[model samples]
Target: GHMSRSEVNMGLSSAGVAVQRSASRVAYNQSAIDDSNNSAWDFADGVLEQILATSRSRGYITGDQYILERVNIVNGNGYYNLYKPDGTYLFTLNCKTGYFVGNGAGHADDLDY
Candidate 1:
């Protein structure tokens, strides 16, 4: 039951569709604002898609593993903490670069990004 990055992205896109649809209802002077919001949302979504793609291409984890354990974006920096289904902290993804970093404890040795 491994999940590919593309599959995850597809799920996200599905939800994005609803947001875009609801935001499309506008008239008068609100047209420009709606358009701007739509474009911004699309651009943000595209960035996320690229981030996942880059993470996958970098081989931080295998395609045969659903390695997205959890996300930890605190203190203004983003960190996608990846783990195996069995709860092993594989690596912490750098959201800015799609690179992996060490987790903690015994996981710190493999910080080979």
Candidate 2:
């Protein structure tokens, strides 16, 4: 069952698809916060959706994968939901790659139009 470089690449390439599929699942349930509820923060992008979907299909991620169970920690910069308190920054990352994908600081209201 030896595999060549191209074969490995192909496998990884296909795996990427699978990983993306699973990533979507992780992103949906693993969200630290979902302000809009518009699914905006759900699957942040195509890559995320793909990886997440892949993970789910392959059993790497599951339906019960909660934020506390998956993410190491959510380091909030400075802010909080209503009655939820402050001193926290909202952010999201690809669970598998640890890549920070979203942030809340950029959407401040005071810098008005």
Candidate 3:
């Protein structure tokens, strides 16, 4: 027995695609405004929130060590190229998929290291 490739592939995310394509998004019955008064850098505050936590938890970094900066910000795609405290390339986060790519392997939500 075999299933149609079209159905097999599209069926995977068909529900999500249908909902998204039809209606956009929103929030709860309550909401608030923002303050565009002042600004700062994408200086990567909570940006590394997940990635760093993952790396540290996964033993990528021992402790509050390598403060992986935005390896590529004003240039190519913004993939977090995790570096050591000594400033050395360690891993490359797939900005397109949200996975840390390194050590001849891939791991994360999107499943790419």
Candidate 4:
């Protein structure tokens, strides 16, 4: 059997850091294809709209101060993070399935701690 130095290096690390890095890189590359082939953003927009509608119906301000906090993909699932005015964390929505998994509370004043 033939093994390259990089392979030996990857195998020697008991923590499997190299393997993790490789997997991350592969996932990153695959995400491009996934984005092009799927309506990920469309799903994200639906998630956002539902959240806003629900918030408004619940008597929340539903103001324009709401901003998108971040969007991330993990293990083939897309998640969206939203922030309220003054930079308070609002919620995290599952873009793919429109599920709210977060506590819906992010205090802006807590950033200093």
Task: Tell me the spans in candidate 4 whose CA falls farther than 4 Å from its real position.
Answer: 1-41, 59-63, 104-113
Off by over 4 Å in 1: 1-61, 104-113
Q: Which structure among the candidates has the greatest TM-score?
A: 4
Question: Candidate 3: how many backbone clashes?
Answer: 4
Q: What does candidate 2's lDDT look like per residue over 1-113, in tens digits?
A: 12321110011222112122222212333344434233333323343334434434645343213111132222321111100011121233432332433333445232121
Candidate 3: stretches off by over 4 Å: 1-47, 73-77, 95-97, 105-113
The TM-score that candidate 4 achieves is 0.46
Cα lDDT tens digits for candidate 3, 1-113:
02322110011222222122111111111111122111211323333445655666877664446534333321223444555554444565633334465543322433221
On TM-score, the stronger of 1 and 2 is 1
User: Among these predicted structures, which one has the highest lDDT?
Assistant: 4
Q: RMSD in angstroms, candidate 2? A: 15.5
lDDT over C-alpha atoms for residue 101 of model 2: 38
Residue pairs that clash (backbone atoms under 3 angstroms), model 4: none
The parts of candidate 2 lying over 4 Å away from their true place are 1-34, 37-43, 61-113
TM-score for each of the candidates: 0.37, 0.21, 0.40, 0.46
For residues 1-113, what per-residue lDDT tens digits would candidate 4 score against the true structure? 02321110001122312221121111223453355444443444345566645544654325333444224454444554444443344455555666544441334221111
Model 1 C-alpha RMSD to native: 13.3
